[PDB]
Design a protein around this ligand. Structure first.
Ligand SMILES: Cc1cc2nc3c(=O)[nH]c(=O)nc-3n(C[C@H](O)[C@H](O)[C@H](O)COP(=O)(O)O)c2cc1C
Ligand SMILES: Cc1cc2nc3c(=O)[nH]c(=O)nc-3n(C[C@H](O)[C@H](O)[C@H](O)COP(=O)(O)O)c2cc1C
Ligand SMILES: [Cl-]
Ligand SMILES: [Cl-]
Lengths: 173, 172
């Protein structure tokens, strides 16, 4: 099988999805790592809504373009559970849920699933449509399915990323 | 080894050997910070690799870093990151956390123990590393070699709530 960098390179953003549904067996594997993931203080504030049926897909579609993906997971963070930093009041809500989302997205990739991470949504429409209580904030939508065209190349990053030297320095800025 | 095995075997290490992290392994860890996606491909992450005395001592002023031999301070650039117009929410924590997660998983594959740290004094970090106002320190990822036997990959039955408490289908 592939090593981690090969997996990380293979993953790309898919916006062209087949009709084909995600097999229950693959969805369950994707979910398992949402639990295995670490969270600040082990607080486990992540709250997931698995969406693969028509009403929910339509509800998400009121808030975002989900590109006819056959499966979406709405990842919320529970601010009643999350750790809060004493110095400045910063809450780990986005961090914890993103670790969870990233773990899912990598696991989905291993299983041959295409995906795209979606933050371009109207959070108010999501709150209303899914009747979210005040303590749950919708953070990420992860879409998954089967690519309908040609996957992006695992060696594209020379063209799609800035050089490493532009994001890393040593000891000081 | 498959992905779930890698994610299971990762745990939070709080006691490290003196052994330094080899350059070859650090470079592989950094490689995935670039590979990782960010919202809009904005690539706002700004990393400071800390493996020398002064920098390790600066971190220790701000946080408990468990005498780790290597730290990466992961900042987000507010001048690059997307700000969502609807509500003003910035992707700073999201984009940086994808990067940091990729790094932590890569470190684990290479036999490096690690711990993610957010319990740090951000004003101390800002001052000590002379961060400009556009750079927000988000995560400190610590790495090295574990001093004792790692935590079990099969521990999650005890160290996590049931999947049923975090997942529902279609509706809450
Ligand atoms: C936090 C985050 C939010 C994103 N939001 C969206 C989104 O709302 N819609 C979309 O089509 N793609 C979205 N993207 C996908 C990015 O455009 C993509 O990751 C980036 O351009 C790099 O492309 P690649 O993933 O194919 O390497 C998002 C990605 C990230 C990491
Ligand atoms: C966002 C985040 C911030 C964390 N901050 C700290 C920290 O400041 N200090 C620390 O000792 N552990 C920190 N942890 C480690 C967690 O306590 C740990 O991941 C959790 O208790 C689960 O244990 P495990 O990682 O061994 O499975 C952090 C973890 C995450 C994900
Ligand atoms: Cl985007
Ligand atoms: Cl032991």
């Amino acid at each position: 099988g592939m090593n981690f960098v090969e997996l990380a390179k293979k993953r790309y953003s898919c916006r062209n999805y087949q009709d084909r549904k995600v097999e229950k067996e693959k969805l369950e594997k994707v979910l398992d790592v949402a639990r295995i993931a670490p969270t600040g203080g082990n607080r486990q504030p992540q709250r997931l809504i698995v969406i693969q049926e028509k009403e929910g897909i339509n509800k998400l579609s009121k808030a975002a373009n989900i590109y006819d993906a056959p499966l979406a997971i709405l990842v919320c963070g529970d601010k009643d559970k999350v750790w809060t930093r004493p110095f400045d009041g910063k809450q780990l809500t986005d961090i914890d849920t993103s670790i969870v989302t990233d773990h899912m997205m990598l696991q989905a990739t291993e299983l041959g699933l295409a995906s795209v991470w979606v933050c371009y949504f109207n959070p108010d429409i999501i709150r209303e449509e899914f009747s979210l209580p005040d303590n749950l904030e919708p953070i990420n939508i992860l879409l998954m399915g089967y690519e309908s065209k040609i996957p992006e190349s695992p060696e594209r990053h020379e063209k799609t990323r800035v050089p490493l030297s532009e994001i890393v320095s040593y000891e000081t800025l």
